[PDB]
Design a protein around this ligand. Structure first.
Ligand SMILES: [Fe+3]
Ligand SMILES: [Fe+3]
Ligand SMILES: [Fe+3]
Ligand SMILES: [Fe+3]
Ligand SMILES: [Fe+3]
Ligand SMILES: [Fe+3]
Ligand SMILES: [Fe+3]
Ligand SMILES: [Fe+3]
Ligand SMILES: [Fe+3]
Ligand SMILES: [Fe+3]
Ligand SMILES: [Fe+3]
Ligand SMILES: [Fe+3]
Ligand SMILES: [Fe+3]
Ligand SMILES: [Fe+3]
Ligand SMILES: [Fe+3]
Ligand SMILES: [Fe+3]
Ligand SMILES: [Fe+3]
Ligand SMILES: [Fe+3]
Ligand SMILES: [Fe+3]
Ligand SMILES: [Fe+3]
Ligand SMILES: [Fe+3]
Ligand SMILES: [Fe+3]
Ligand SMILES: [Fe+3]
Ligand SMILES: [Fe+3]
Ligand SMILES: [Fe+3]
Ligand SMILES: [Fe+3]
Ligand SMILES: [Fe+3]
Ligand SMILES: [Fe+3]
Ligand SMILES: [Fe+3]
Ligand SMILES: [Fe+3]
Ligand SMILES: [Fe+3]
Ligand SMILES: [Fe+3]
Ligand SMILES: [Fe+3]
Ligand SMILES: [Fe+3]
Ligand SMILES: [Fe+3]
Ligand SMILES: [Fe+3]
Ligand SMILES: [Fe+3]
Ligand SMILES: [Fe+3]
Ligand SMILES: [Fe+3]
Ligand SMILES: [Fe+3]
Ligand SMILES: [Fe+3]
Ligand SMILES: [Fe+3]
Ligand SMILES: [Fe+3]
Ligand SMILES: [Fe+3]
Ligand SMILES: [Fe+3]
Ligand SMILES: [Fe+3]
Ligand SMILES: [O]
Ligand SMILES: [O]
Ligand SMILES: [O]
Ligand SMILES: [O]
Ligand SMILES: [O]
Ligand SMILES: [O]
Ligand SMILES: [O]
Ligand SMILES: [O]
Ligand SMILES: [O]
Ligand SMILES: [O]
Ligand SMILES: [O]
Ligand SMILES: [O]
Lengths: 172, 172, 172, 172
């Protein structure tokens, strides 16, 4: 590569791998989005919530791909694994799954930062710090808040809570 | 002091002392504000409510300090005591604590008015009557209303009530 | 904590401690602000200068508190120690005190960055780098410039210099 | 009087007397104003300062006269005594004289408030509290600040200070 400088083969491949993780997370969110739009689930606000994250994750991988090109890395794509479930249960279940996905993404981000730091690649370290790390923290905090509100609305009259949360917290 | 006139050393020091009470009340509200923002509490509207009072109390003490300077008094600051609790419980608990704090502030205000009146210092009496006494009464009334609405939403399905009150009464 | 990830108990507590330092610095600036507003000090521009820093420091601790909540840390507050002095002398004295306070804050910031770096917590490292480190450097530079201008206006006709500096450098 | 109610003959006459004090204070300010406009004094900003107070004092007595009519009192005017001096010296001298005049006015105000309070005439007590007492306190504070700035600009190079203060503090 005429442009490549300070860009380890290790990072290059870990970036390719994080791309596949973003693709799969996007794909998971697509599944959660349409699931909440089913006539027998019918929670427009929850659907919108997940559709938006699908979009957010797509920006993630396109920004990773762009950065790959800018550093002189070469993108390589693998199969995108289908989401882990095909029915996602109730809002709290779905939200716990999302939370678990975000934590895995965040760990992958932190692991790549550790790696690029180990290769003293500050450009890469400062590409994650800016476009990913804070986004992940905000989002995880939000999902925590959501789970707390769903939990407080749970138990006996839980059908009613799921309705209220979708109507009064989520934007349609 | 070249400016001091009709301004008793007694008032001067009681004002310094009310300043410390405002500082501590502000500080209490700061604690209530962040507490309701914790991921495991998650009531944005309640948080906003207390954050705003912190701000209101800060205006209180800055107006007291300004008046001190205008009368030719000398400000003296003491340590600000940490808030009484570090976990504030549920909305009704927090609101009862706030109500108790406002009543203490109101009594301190009334006690200083009695004092300045006893020193026939009408300026001071009419500085409290204007900038503090009515503000306190309105605010206490509001917290009463709040407690009544929380109480009516309490008992068996109390998690649901706390959600509804934060969503439908408090502004986010 | 359902949200906590890569957030050491060490950082959590050092953040709580930096919060108390910001509270105390804010408190110091409040004291400097009203001091310069006394009828027998009477330097509106110097007063405004310190009042603004009080406000700046308050943003510091509220941003620290918010970040604490976002990482899943738990805020804990301690007593806020009264400022070190109750009379602050002349503009150069006050400004030297402010400079000394900012240097202490900056060292606390650098020490927390070292710590979070030692815990490989890049989120925290990049929260300080963005919202605090450059702000501190700019501010310290400004106070240096100020001290240089006050020093150049010092010595024999020093009362005149303090007037000119407040009128021609500070904004009222 | 068909309208008079709760309005003691004592207050009525003390109001007539405060009117004469306002007339005389206005008159003093007129003298200070033109004095600073003399070709051999030549401090436009100081002149403006006193001209404005003359105007302020005139509003004082017209508001007193209006209130007299509203309560069903009868205005009675006496001779207005010439000002105490015909040359007013330098800015600090003039400002010390003004300060002394304002303190006398403030004491007359406080004495009338005591009196109306002794006649349980809250209307009168609350006419002073609103239109006079705070105005006096602000103004006295301002004259204090002024004297402090003039004092800091005094001593050896005092001609230069008087120029700078008029140029940089007073509005022309
Ligand atoms: Fe979108
Ligand atoms: Fe869209
Ligand atoms: Fe959309
Ligand atoms: Fe988006
Ligand atoms: Fe986006
Ligand atoms: Fe984004
Ligand atoms: Fe977008
Ligand atoms: Fe974006
Ligand atoms: Fe299944
Ligand atoms: Fe960085
Ligand atoms: Fe970095
Ligand atoms: Fe809809
Ligand atoms: Fe506000
Ligand atoms: Fe605000
Ligand atoms: Fe606000
Ligand atoms: Fe407010
Ligand atoms: Fe306000
Ligand atoms: Fe207010
Ligand atoms: Fe406000
Ligand atoms: Fe206000
Ligand atoms: Fe506790
Ligand atoms: Fe009143
Ligand atoms: Fe009153
Ligand atoms: Fe909201
Ligand atoms: Fe500001
Ligand atoms: Fe401000
Ligand atoms: Fe301001
Ligand atoms: Fe600011
Ligand atoms: Fe700011
Ligand atoms: Fe800032
Ligand atoms: Fe600001
Ligand atoms: Fe800012
Ligand atoms: Fe001292
Ligand atoms: Fe960094
Ligand atoms: Fe000014
Ligand atoms: Fe005018
Ligand atoms: Fe005019
Ligand atoms: Fe005019
Ligand atoms: Fe006027
Ligand atoms: Fe006027
Ligand atoms: Fe007026
Ligand atoms: Fe006018
Ligand atoms: Fe007026
Ligand atoms: Fe004479
Ligand atoms: Fe009154
Ligand atoms: Fe001019
Ligand atoms: O969207
Ligand atoms: O987005
Ligand atoms: O985004
Ligand atoms: O606010
Ligand atoms: O406010
Ligand atoms: O307020
Ligand atoms: O401000
Ligand atoms: O600010
Ligand atoms: O700021
Ligand atoms: O005027
Ligand atoms: O006026
Ligand atoms: O006025």
């Amino acid at each position: 590569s005429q442009i490549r400088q300070n860009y380890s083969t290790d990072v290059e491949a870990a970036v390719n791998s994080l791309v596949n993780l973003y693709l799969q997370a996007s794909y998971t969110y697509l599944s959660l989005g349409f699931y909440f739009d089913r006539d027998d689930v019918a929670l427009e606000g929850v659907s919108h919530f997940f559709r938006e994250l699908a979009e957010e994750k797509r920006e993630g991988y396109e920004r990773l791909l762009k950065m790959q090109n800018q550093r002189g890395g070469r993108a390589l794509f693998q199969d995108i694994k289908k989401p882990a479930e095909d029915e996602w249960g109730k809002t709290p279940d779905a939200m716990k799954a999302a939370m678990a996905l975000e934590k895995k993404l965040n760990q992958a981000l932190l692991d790549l930062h550790a790696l690029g730091s180990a290769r003293t690649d500050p450009h890469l370290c400062d590409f994650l710090e800016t476009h990913f790390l804070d986004e992940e923290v905000k989002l995880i905090k939000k999902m925590g808040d959501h789970l707390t509100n769903l939990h407080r609305l749970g138990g006996p009259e839980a059908g009613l809570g799921e309705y209220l949360f979708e109507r009064l917290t989520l934007k349609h």
